[PDB]
């Protein structure tokens, strides 16, 4: 019953094409609700879910200033990271960030997050203590010694245990008709021969709200996760997710196979068969 | 609510 609020931001240098593009997005669990795009005309934090749309002018003004301040902070950090690695201005470079909190189901705050990545590699991350840093590089250790003296980890701990949980609970009630609902997967099966003696049985799962789900193929042996084909979970675009798994079966032996589907919206796991 | 990032690397 735990929940999460998360903000993912991506800053991308574009040498010769002006200041780096900066994108930031906000999630409550698996539902995006807000965004910022430096290339967009508004230069404003923008709603992306129906329930956030009624926040007053103070909220959109204040959230816009915090995310614009982050965009300027990550412009300089790209220039600083270019110096730490002694790299040329030629070529684009990426600086990602992830932060947020995992409040429980009214068990309140449980965990916070504050991470950075440069060119797809870990750079620095707040530990679960919210009091110590994990620098991945020799150059990230420079930032770790600097952030240690400034006690910025106390600032993030004050945010992750405070404003992060205060906003996450507030979003959970305003979106309670959406965020708190669970959609069980809708399940069905297909049967296409691929050769004369074989068949590809495909177990489908559609329309489930939380992205987390488990699709498992079983023969008589109750598990064969070595010949099973499984696709990445994907967004339908209407707020639900979809996933499917396939297994190769002998023709006339389809009954030996059984598909198991587990999801939060199901009172008990399903058993699918031909 | 958005975080309060201003510190530099």
């Amino acid at each position, epitope marked *: 019953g735990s929940h999460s609020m998360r903000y993912f931001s991506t800053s991308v240098s574009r040498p010769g094409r002006g200041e780096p593009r900066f994108i930031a997005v906000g999630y409550v669990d698996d539902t995006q609700f807000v965004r910022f795009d430096s290339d967009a005309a508004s230069q404003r934090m923008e709603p992306r879910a129906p329930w956030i749309e009624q926040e007053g002018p103070e909220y959109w003004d204040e959230e816009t200033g*915090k995310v614009k301040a982050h965009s300027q902070t990550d412009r300089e950090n790209l220039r600083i990271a270019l110096r730490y690695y002694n790299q040329s201005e030629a070529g684009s470079h990426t600086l990602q960030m992830m932060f947020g909190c995992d409040v429980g189901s009214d068990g309140r705050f449980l965990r916070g997050y504050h991470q950075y990545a440069y060119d797809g590699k870990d750079y620095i991350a707040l530990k679960e203590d919210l009091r110590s840093w994990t620098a991945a590089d020799m150059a990230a250790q420079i930032t770790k010694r600097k952030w240690e003296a400034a006690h910025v980890a106390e600032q993030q701990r*004050a945010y992750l245990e405070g404003t992060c949980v205060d906003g996450l609970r507030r979003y959970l009630e305003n979106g309670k008709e959406t965020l708190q609902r669970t959609d069980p997967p809708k399940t069905h099966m297909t049967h296409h021969p691929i050769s004369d003696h074989e068949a590809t049985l495909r177990c489908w799962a559609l329309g489930f709200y939380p992205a987390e789900i488990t699709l498992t193929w079983q023969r008589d042996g109750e598990d064969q996760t070595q010949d099973t084909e499984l696709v990445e979970t994907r967004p339908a675009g209407d707020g639900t997710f979809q996933k499917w798994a396939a297994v190769v079966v002998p023709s006339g032996e389809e009954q030996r196979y059984t598909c198991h589907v587990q999801h939060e919206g199901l009172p008990k796991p399903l058993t699918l068969r031909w | 609510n958005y975080n*309060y990032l*201003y510190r*530099l690397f």
Partner: T-cell receptor
Amino acid sequence: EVEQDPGPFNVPEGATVAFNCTYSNSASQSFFWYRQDCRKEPKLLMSVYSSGNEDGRFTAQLNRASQYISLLIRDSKLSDSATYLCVVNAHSGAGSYQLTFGKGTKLSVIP
Amino acid sequence: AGVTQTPKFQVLKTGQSMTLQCAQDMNHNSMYWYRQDPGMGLRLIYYSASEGTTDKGEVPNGYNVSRLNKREFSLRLESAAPSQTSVYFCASSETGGYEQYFGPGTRLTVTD
């Protein structure tokens, strides 16, 4: 806004003197004590950390819940006579982070 | 490694023009101009988040600025009035939220 002790503090040498400061904006992010000798520039004294920051005779504590700041000076000297500014770092309504400087409290140690 | 500021004192007839000067060698990106009046704390006039950019503060009217380099940030009174009689300080900081090291400060008495 930032408010602190009206002052002036007139204490004899060797005294322990405590400063009090309160900040209204609950979103404030960094906190400092600044000192400014008469007819001269402000200078940073120490950062208030709310875990406790002490530097010899000077100690400072931050109460995030009360939103109040305190400076503690043990063994007052005449070299401590100054105006002590409360400095708070709060995001403005725009995308900039500014420091609001308090009016401060004049300390006047007399031997 | 500090902040320097000129002049240290100045009289100005009403309507006289003046440009205070400031510089920092600490490789900071942010620079600020404050005015300190009796009975009130520091009041931001203009600041500069980084090179090529300047923005306003609490008391910007009657003043203008110019961020020449990363090093320099000057503040000009293009028409001096008694209301501007105050003690002006320049200051510098790594970026927005960092502690601001201050300059020696300038004394202005814009009188006849």
